[PDB]
Amino acid sequence: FIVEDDESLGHKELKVRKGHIAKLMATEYQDEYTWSSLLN
């Protein structure tokens, strides 16, 4: 998991957020993100 040091919200944070993993959940239960489509 990548981390940017700087943050407008402050201290230090990993870049990935709740919306991305929500989209991953939606694509899994679709039955258009992939692992590669997160990588790009």
């Binding site: 929500a22 959940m25 939606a26 239960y29």
Partner: peptide, 20 residues
């Protein structure tokens, strides 16, 4: 505390259906 011994998934899928 809740301490999360167990977790739910589709209830949250539904919560994001209302959120989006």
């Amino acid at each position: 505390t809740n301490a999360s011994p167990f977790i739910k998934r589709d209830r949250m899928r539904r919560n994001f259906l209302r959120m989006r």
